[PDB]
């Protein structure tokens, strides 16, 4: 559990760096209601598919810069 929380927080550390907000607005669809009422514990005990899609968008789009991007790709590979 502690490691898992570490991972979620790590992703968020990533997101803070930049252009997270714009993607969020554009991305959210029908699933969106579920997304918005997601608690931290929900991430702690993960809801894997949505994050994977979002992360993919972070990488596909320009937002992630340099080293960050490499890290998600690593992440998707490792736990995705």
């Amino acid at each position: 559990l502690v490691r898992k929380s570490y991972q979620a927080l790590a992703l968020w550390k990533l997101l803070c760096e930049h252009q997270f907000t714009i993607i969020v607005a554009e991305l959210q669809k029908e699933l969106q209601e579920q997304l918005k009422i997601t608690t931290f514990k929900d991430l702690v005990i993960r809801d894997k598919e949505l994050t994977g899609a979002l992360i993919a968008s972070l990488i596909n789009c320009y937002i992630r810069d340099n080293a960050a991007v490499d890290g998600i790709s690593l992440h998707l590979q490792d736990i995705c």
Binding site: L14, E17, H18, C61, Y62, D65, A68, V69, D70, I72
Partner: protein
């Protein structure tokens, strides 16, 4: 640039087109690493690419606005630009070269090195480490 996005948020100016290339194109998978960045923008990379495009004047302007502290270089950029681009001052060129060797050569941000080396013709042994990406 001519294909979706934002459509870039701002005007179609050449500078912004290059910012887009640098930002959207592959400088970031999901952004990061070893550039000098102010307000979300790699200035040196920008100058390098603008220069690459042939937009020397714009590159010069970027440097002017830059917030940097190698400022002597700033001087040497502008006159390189002013002339036929073979900026040959009977004066300083020598001085620029020494600084490159001592300070810049063993260190720095790849793009910064590129700009110095290319503009200066600083070190004739030739090749730019990190950012030669195409033939």
């Amino acid at each position: 640039v001519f294909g979706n996005l934002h459509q870039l948020g701002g005007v179609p100016g050449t500078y912004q087109l290059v910012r887009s290339f640098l930002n959207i194109k592959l400088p970031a998978p999901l952004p990061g690493l070893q550039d000098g960045e102010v307000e979300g923008h790699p200035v040196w990379a920008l100058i390098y690419y603008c220069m690459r495009c042939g937009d020397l004047l714009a590159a010069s302007q970027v440097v002017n606005r830059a917030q940097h502290q190698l400022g002597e270089f700033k001087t040497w950029f502008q006159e390189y630009m002013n002339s036929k681009d073979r900026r040959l001052s009977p004066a300083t060129e020598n001085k620029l070269r020494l600084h490159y060797r001592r300070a810049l050569r063993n260190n720095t941000d790849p793009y910064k090195r590129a700009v110095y080396c290319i503009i200066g013709r600083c070190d004739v042994t030739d090749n730019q480490s990190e950012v030669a990406d195409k033939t």
